[PDB]
Amino acid sequence: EVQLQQSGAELARPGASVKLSCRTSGYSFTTYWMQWVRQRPGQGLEWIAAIYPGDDDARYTQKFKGKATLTADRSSSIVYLQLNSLTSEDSAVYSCSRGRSLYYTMDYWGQGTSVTVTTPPSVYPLAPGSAAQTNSMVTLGCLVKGYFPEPVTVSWNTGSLSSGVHTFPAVLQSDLYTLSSSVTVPSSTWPSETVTCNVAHPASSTKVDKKIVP
Amino acid sequence: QAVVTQESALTTSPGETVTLTCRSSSGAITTSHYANWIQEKPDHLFTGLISGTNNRAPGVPARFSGSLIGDKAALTITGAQTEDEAIYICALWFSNQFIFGSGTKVTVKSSPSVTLFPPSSEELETNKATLVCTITDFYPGVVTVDWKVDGTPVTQGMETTQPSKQSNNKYMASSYLTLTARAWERHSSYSCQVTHEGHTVEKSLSAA
Ligand SMILES: C[C@]12CC[C@@H]3c4ccc(O)cc4/C(=N/OCC(=O)O)C[C@H]3[C@@H]1CC[C@@H]2O
């Protein structure tokens, strides 16, 4: 029962500076190390810095010693990694893991947050037909059309609907992405119970909850 | 910096045993490099396997073993699983930071489930019509989708994704048929057809 959840996708202009965050649940926030790694477009993980929450001991490396600061909020079990003066160089996926010592470390991680250094989506609800409602399982869907850039975060019932969810790979057609997400539930569940897909496009500060009705 | 190296890729079979090496450009890898192996699965899903050169982490199938074999640090997989297919990253300690390897990628039949969705009322109103065909549950990840309108094949206005490995160790993809409200009503049916491993699967929906 250990999980480190990170903040959402981040789109930033060059020269600016983002504030990322990793929150821990399931262990001694203060008696454990917190490291940050990043993965550029296809360049293997790079070590950035680490912090010991319950003793505010943050250790950096030559490379990031300048644009990378790291703080802890022992009162929320959250660690902020802040990067200053952003460059195309910094566009990557920042993840975070924990560690007790050089012998035991980097076992659990976060899903990682993507930073990119805009046009919002049009969300359309997709009600099931004869080729979606299939006896015991009916599957609703959401068309997230013409947005830019990646990514979009699609959720169902604010995350309550976690199983049977399938977000398909986006497709590019004229510098505009369009993707689809589906969720399957028991044919008794809907229309009976409400089903809403929550789409979020960090890049454009846009969030759309579209109720999927029959 | 001290560049760490690994084997690009490795094709293995179930049950077998595979060994992955991790060689350092600084020289011999020792217990002071606190070798650490990390498993990476689709969508940046990192998982700890071995730290401190040879200590299995909580929840690690004993088939996984870390040990120093020569000037190298290696990971041994005694008893392959289909789920054990992934990217293996070793990390060597170099006083004050871990240096990672670009990763070793190890490789280890289901018919697809087709799901069509007709245009959204809202979208139709914009005189647009997007037919959605979401393809799932298939392996190997290699399909050919074709769209038919009134039993006749259509080439234009079709967008199909790239297979994506799912957590259930199966691929999924999606195809789109972009039409005009006109065209959508102007026809009797639309057929999303998928061809996979020799056989074909197809579904259809009628504007009617
Ligand atoms: C890799 C690690 C984060 C980075 C820490 C670091 C970072 C920089 C540095 O110069 C030395 C050290 C160590 N030096 O001395 C140890 C201390 O005095 O306790 C302990 C490392 C930590 C071990 C567990 C965690 O995952």
Topology, please?
The complex is a heterodimer of chains A (214) and B (208).
Chain A (H helix, E strand, L loop, with lengths): L2 E4 L3 E2 L5 E9 L7 E7 L5 E8 L4 E4 L7 E6 L4 E7 L7 E8 L5 E5 L3 E4 L5 E5 L6 E2 L2 E11 L5 E4 L8 E3 L3 E2 L4 E10 L9 E6 L4 E6 L3
Chain B lengths: L3 E2 L3 E3 L5 E8 L11 E6 L3 E7 L3 E2 L7 E6 L2 E7 L7 E8 L4 E3 L3 E4 L5 E5 L3 H5 L2 E11 L4 E7 L2 E3 L3 E3 L3 E3 L3 E11 H6 L3 E7 L2 E7 L3
The complex binds estradiol-6 carboxyl-methyl-oxime (ECO).
PDB class: immune system
Keywords: IGG fold, antibody-hapten complex, estradiol, immune system
Assembly: dimeric
How would you describe what is shown here?
The complex is a heterodimer of chains A (214) and B (208). Chain A has 2 domains: 2-116, Immunoglobulin-like (Sandwich), CATH 2.60.40.10; 117-213, Sandwich (Immunoglobulin-like), CATH 2.60.40. Helix content of chain A is 0%, strand content 53%. Chain A is built from no helices and 20 strands. In chain A, 39% of the residues are buried. Chain B folds into 2 domains: 1-109, Immunoglobulins (Immunoglobulin-like); 110-207, Sandwich (Immunoglobulin-like). The longest helix of chain B has 6 residues, at 181-186. Chain B is elongated. Estradiol-6 carboxyl-methyl-oxime is lined by residues 33, 35, 50, 59, 99, 101-102, 105 of chain A. Estradiol-6 carboxyl-methyl-oxime binds at residues 33, 35, 50, 59, 99, 101-102, 105 of chain A.
Task: Return the CATH architecture of the largest domain in chain B.
Answer: Sandwich
The named CATH superfamily of the largest domain in chain B? Immunoglobulins
- If you compute it from the alpha carbons, what radius of gyration of chain B comes out, rounded to the nearest whole angstrom? 24 Å
Number of separate structural domains of chain B:
2
